Amino acid sequence: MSYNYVVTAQKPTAVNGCVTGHFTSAEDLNLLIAKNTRLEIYVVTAEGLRPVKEVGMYGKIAVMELFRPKGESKDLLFILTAKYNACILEYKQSGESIDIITRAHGNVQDRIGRPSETGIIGIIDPECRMIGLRLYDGLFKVIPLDRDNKELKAFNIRLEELHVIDVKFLYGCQAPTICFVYQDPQGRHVKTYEVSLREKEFNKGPWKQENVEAEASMVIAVPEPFGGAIIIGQESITYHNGDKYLAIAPPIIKQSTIVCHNRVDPNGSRYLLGDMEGRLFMLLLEKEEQMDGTVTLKDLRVELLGETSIAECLTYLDNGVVFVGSRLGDSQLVKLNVDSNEQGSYVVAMETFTNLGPIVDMCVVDLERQGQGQLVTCSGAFKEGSLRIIRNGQKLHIRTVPLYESPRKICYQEVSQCFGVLSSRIEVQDTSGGTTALRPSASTQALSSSVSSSKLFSSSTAPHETSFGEEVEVHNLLIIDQHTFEVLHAHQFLQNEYALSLVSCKLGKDPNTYFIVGTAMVYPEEAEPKQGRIVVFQYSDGKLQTVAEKEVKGAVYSMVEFNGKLLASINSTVRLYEWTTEKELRTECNHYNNIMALYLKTKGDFILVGDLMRSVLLLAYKPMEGNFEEIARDFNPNWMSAVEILDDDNFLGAENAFNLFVCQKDSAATTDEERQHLQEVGLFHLGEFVNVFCHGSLVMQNLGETSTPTQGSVLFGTVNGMIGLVTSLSESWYNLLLDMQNRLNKVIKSVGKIEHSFWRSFHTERKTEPATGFIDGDLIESFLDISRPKMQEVVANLQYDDGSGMKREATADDLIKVVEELTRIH
Amino acid sequence: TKPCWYWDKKDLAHTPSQLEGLDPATEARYRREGARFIFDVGTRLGLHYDTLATGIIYFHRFYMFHSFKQFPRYVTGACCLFLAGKVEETPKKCKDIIKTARSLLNDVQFGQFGDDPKEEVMVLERILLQTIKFDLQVEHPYQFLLKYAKQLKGDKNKIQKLVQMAWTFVNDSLCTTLSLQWEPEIIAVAVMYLAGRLCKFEIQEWTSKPMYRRWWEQFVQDVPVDVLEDICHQILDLYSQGKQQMP
Amino acid sequence: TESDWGKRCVDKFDIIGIIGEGTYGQVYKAKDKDTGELVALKKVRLDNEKEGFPITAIREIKILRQLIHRSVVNMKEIVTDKQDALDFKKDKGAFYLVFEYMDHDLMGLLESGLVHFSEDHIKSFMKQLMEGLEYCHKKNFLHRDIKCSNILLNNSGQIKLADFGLARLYNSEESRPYTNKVITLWYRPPELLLGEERYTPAIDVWSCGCILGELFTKKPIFQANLELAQLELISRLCGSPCPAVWPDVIRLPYFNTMKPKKQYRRRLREEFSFIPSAALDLLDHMLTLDPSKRCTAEQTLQSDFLKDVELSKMAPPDL
């Protein structure tokens, strides 16, 4: 078996959702911001948000909504986790003591159902009579909000429309009414039903079905003065309400998909709309009052306000303040002004909240020679792309390097005192036949530049037609200075060439240090790329020189330096190249028993391969023979997102389901079959998407002073900006910390009353297993925050099993020291 | 695709056994003794009739590729029955086959098994499988005797007498190389043909074509009377060489 | 000739890797040196010496040289390790069963979470599977371990049934003692949970119906670790075993011993309301508690869902 320890170095920074209401007091306006597994509560002031409380939950926050049922003084909070843990929460404050009350809770998972494409949707009735949940295709789940439903029991109503895009409860109906857009073979439609708690079924809805735009994306519930709904698409915005129908199709919204909306005026007159290119729009509802006294919707208008970060969620606060919640870039507070500035913009940024964004790749480098190590991360996407330099100093110091284009891979080349970074920028087919970039960015603002002139694929004779307005990716290699972080050089790869892999190394007997890039020719027609290059570059005297190119028959997804040789994965093949005295790559040997060799890691003569659907394989280079040999494979099927080698026998992997596992050589030589079987010894639900594993640590350890029990250091970056650390334990230390977790889980009160053991259980749609081999360090590190009475309760009847102290009963102060030592690894 | 398992009578003059100086009478005796050994041993173990026959067919085919002077027959027989049990889903442990073989064979005969009987048998399985070319599925005259007779309608007692007499003839033919000359279907009609002659029954009357004198032709097409008689001659020869009489 | 198996040496294949671990050996992927065809080699270790050649392999060699069908896996030949020329006794070399190579297995396409099946894809999949099962069931063979792992899929959309290690013949005239623990619990029929031991070809139909549901939910329908727990889960959806819906349930050994918590009503149509009607009828008939009332393979092929499907339009699963 294996024993490992996992802790968070940086908590998730991406904003998954944001709501505003009256949660902490019936009087204050609060902004609740949801990051993965983290809930942040702020109090809205006119100068700026005031932080009041932060809690963690043992689950990914999927739905977050505030409601105030009749009889309550203040808003209550509904949350549903991605594992279907539901709960209703209340803020309660006793002077200085702030706590979160779990008013109702339960798990709403169905034994039989198909998870929907557009994900979990949660909405609440305007009269707070029920919570609507869309979890599975063909089913609508109703949790009625009666006082007695403390377990959140619910029932399912059969839904004929299997493919639902979005749903909202409508305002101003005689009965609870849902409005939704659905897709069937005839296109997309908008339809209504009434929800009957008494009959537990749908009744005919207030207005008839209307055919809508093919890419109708979002449904807006319009408040009582108007009533009805607005439907946002790619090209058009429409309003529906019984007999009334409006449509505005301003060409400005066609350029970029609109992804988020928020109501500004409670009456419903103004809405904020945001799009993927970061534009902020005002949607205006122009009113007309008849002599009858009735208020009708005359027309719709859209006005561009300015530019914000690419926002997953928008919330208007007060005055002109809007919270721009970003998952791809930095979250922001922006001021909306009545008068435009001299550039024509009405938006003026106030504060910028750091988001490590998606961490596509990262490397650890000791820039200042301080025997520490700093983390340079490829963070963000599109106009939010950046390079983030992170060091420890008690908070983490982060320096932001903007790129305004997507960073894909980073590697450090010390000889050249610079980083190599692979990037891609979006251009659009224009009337010239070429393409035009939407904004200047790193690859275009380089001091010196070059473009590949390779003739390898030039024979073409394969037609790829272009339509005006279509997007393309343009890939580059950026040479960036390690001190100024100034783009010294940018190399642009071929048209339709994707840069996928990057390494910096010396090969063979060649003393020169090269940048080597692996590419794939990507054409929309192809299911899998069938052409590719391995390109050797030399960065010398401010210019990048092309040294050699090797054509391959596939995508070079990953490369790694291997004992002076170049190990590269081309689709199914894993290949080892030698670097000749003629400065060309020469193939030595290949391995073909792979579906897609997405990831490669090496140690000694051993190679770890990560496959799209076959988990991990341990290969070895047999130098006596000049070939490869399969040492061991993990036969359990998993889809890999990243891999890392922990030691000669243990191997770490990350699943696309937000899970971690460790595989080991079965070390039993009785049969060959045992050695070929890697036994999954560790299973752990992380809750984050790990893109990059990287050996290193951010703390400045001489290791001459007391070394912590943990041994080894692997850092990992995730999609939600979370940075974590994995380290190994001895059998003695694992059992102590494990026995302690079980004790801590009995003592600590969870938000939503979510069992900790459930949360960390390995979870795919198909399987659920109890965690094994992993210590939730974030649980262990919470011992230092529980009350002194609670601490003593945890340490009762505890004995050790360490050989120095045969059996050692614990005191609270003894364990306070053990955990404090563990907090020093990060 | 599939191997050919049938030879001509003339070809049996050239088995390995014959060419190593064994005369025709001796090889025939060895075949009867080995087959009857398989039969008696399996009967002691309670084995289905198909399992006995399959072992016997494996045995007869084996000695079309090897000589009796280099492969002791009772070891081969025991191995055939052992494999046949697994093929036909009536498995037996090798030790139990040896136990029974010890009871039935005298000390000279059980000498063939050598110092370690189980080992000599288990070792042979590799050669047996390679020899029979991994073609394990075998059909036997019994199923056709029953399938064909089910289509006879008439005196219940005369037909049952026909079936049992023919069934006896099938059991006796396993001691011969007929398994190597003719497909089971021809053997089944032949045993029906012989019993009908011996009981003075006219089978055509019981067929759906009562004026079709060649009744076999609806069951097995293209079977000459010569083939059916050659088989009969060979079966009754066992009854004239030994001192038992046509049933 | 092509028929003289057991002699050709495994030298004739370049081993590419180990695709899986089998019951009697480890399964390797190999390229034929002469033709270039990719094959799958199953290693048979006879070195065990306790009972010689494994009977699980004997069943697969006996049955798969008889069965010819597009949806039944094909055994191309049997090859051997370099044998010892001097002595036949010393030789312990193993034997390899050559099969056609298949790109993936259904469990893998599903466990990795990558594949999305449309109705038409499920039609082309089930039509091939049931057609193969009919060929086998008409030849009086029982598969006896139908699982997602044992359904091999090509990228083109061809399906082949594969692991015939527990396959045996069925006789209507003679009820025979069989092993009452054949199909894996998730796909095991209710009849065998109560231990029938004398079962119909319907055992395999139940499994294929479980797969039909799993193709629509992307999650296995009846997942449990204990035989009683499975009976309860099946009972919740298909209804509790009772004399009215399954008259002869009383003749089953464990009917009094094994009991669901309640006598649950059948809710199959309700819980699978999202499944198309043409398919839902198939599922209700395939997941029928009573083996004598459970539909046959042929009846599934003459169903509104699968009858008018064209195998020429083998629409590939979305990959």
Ligand SMILES: COc1cc2nc(CN3CCc4sccc4C3)[nH]c(=O)c2cc1OC
């Ligand atoms: C033991 O049953 C069998 C399973 C089989 N699975 C596959 C799928 N592979 C595709 C390539 C790879 S790389 C690692 C795992 C995988 C699975 N392909 C086969 O040809 C095959 C043949 C079999 O028996 C004859």
